[PDB]
Design a protein around this ligand. Structure first.
Ligand SMILES: *CCC(=O)Nc1ccc(-c2ccc3[nH]ncc3c2)cc1
Length: 320
């Protein structure tokens, strides 16, 4: 549409991996690094009146730099489109993992869950909420590490908090705690705590808040579930009693580190060098350009090289 002209100077588009109202998600290759990314393509005409909301959410996502959050690399706006280029997570969904394993042990649940708590605590600390936590929104990277996707812009009632489903106003943070409790139950049980074959019956079950507790759950498991799965949001554990929770600490003996192990700005010298070489710049000039953080092609190349580095791979741009 000529909306793809600019994009295709930087990316080679592969297969669609997701569709929806307002948005399509495509696999793609960033040409300069050869790295795979995911590109969320949004039509401005479809958004119409909601376009300002999306721009706001885009800005929120620029400040969500965290090891367990799928990272934004590039925002390209054309006359009709907004493209958001995001970190590719090759390990597939937590959902797929749970099924393949049938249910996870308490021990392995804990490995996975601490990562979720880390991401979600970080989101909440920035004054945001996810509002749609579920195993489909948690992807593994190359190293079986979890990355949270899909904040807003887009979009399962099984994971929704009682106050959300009753359409009342709800605090995102509190609804997230509920959803995380459902997630906890599913990880350790391999099935939903609340299920039914029609919405009204499911809604009733969720609002009643009663579920079975299988025989294999530890007392401590059962107790953390009871603290999270409280129909009354006010009675739900806070995210901060959760980082410190005895169940969370068993076998680690230290709380979830939720703060981003991410440099405020502190640029990576190897990434800057590679860009300086490529652009024929002196180091200071290159650092000054990167430091504008425009989420243009430079931001994207920089962030991709930095992810190449963080994953022990070579910090190199393909150039022939
Ligand atoms: C709104 C349409 C839709 O299907 N949503 C959606 C959002 C995000 C992804 C996604 C994002 C990032 C990523 N990295 N590796 C895989 C993915 C998928 C897909 C679909």
């Amino acid at each position: 549409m000529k909306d793809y002209d600019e994009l295709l100077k930087y990316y080679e588009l592969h297969e669609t991996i997701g569709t929806g109202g307002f948005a399509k998600v495509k696999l793609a290759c960033h040409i300069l690094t050869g790295e795979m990314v995911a590109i969320k393509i949004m039509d401005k005409n479809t958004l119409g009146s909601d376009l300002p909301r999306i721009k706001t959410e885009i800005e929120a996502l620029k400040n969500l730099r965290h090891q367990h959050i799928c990272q934004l690399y590039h925002v390209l706006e054309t006359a009709n489109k907004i493209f958001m280029v995001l970190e590719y997570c090759p390990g597939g969904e937590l959902f797929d993992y749970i099924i393949s394993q049938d249910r996870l042990s308490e021990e392995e649940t804990r490995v996975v869950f601490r990562q979720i708590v880390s991401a979600v605590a970080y989101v909440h600390s920035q004054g945001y909420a996810h509002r749609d936590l579920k195993p489909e929104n948690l992807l593994f990277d190359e190293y079986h590490k979890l990355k949270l996707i899909d904040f807003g812009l887009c979009a399962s009632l099984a994971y929704a908090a009682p106050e959300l489903i009753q359409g009342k106003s709800y605090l995102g943070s509190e609804a997230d705690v509920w959803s995380m409790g459902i997630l906890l139950y599913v990880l350790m049980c391999g099935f939903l705590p609340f299920d039914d074959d029609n919405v009204m019956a499911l809604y009733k079950k969720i609002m009643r808040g009663k579920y079975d507790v299988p025989k294999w759950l530890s007392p401590s498991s059962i107790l953390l579930l009871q603290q999270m799965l409280q129909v009354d949001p006010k009675k739900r554990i806070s995210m901060k009693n959760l980082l410190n929770h005895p169940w969370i600490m068993q076998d680690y003996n230290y709380p979830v580190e939720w703060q981003s192990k991410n440099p405020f700005i502190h640029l990576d010298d190897d990434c800057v060098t590679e860009l300086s070489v490529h652009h024929r710049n002196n180091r200071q000039t290159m650092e000054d350009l990167i430091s504008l953080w425009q989420y243009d092609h430079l931001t994207a190349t920089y962030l991709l090289l930095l992810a190449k580095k963080a994953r022990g791979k070579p910090v190199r741009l393909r150039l022939s």
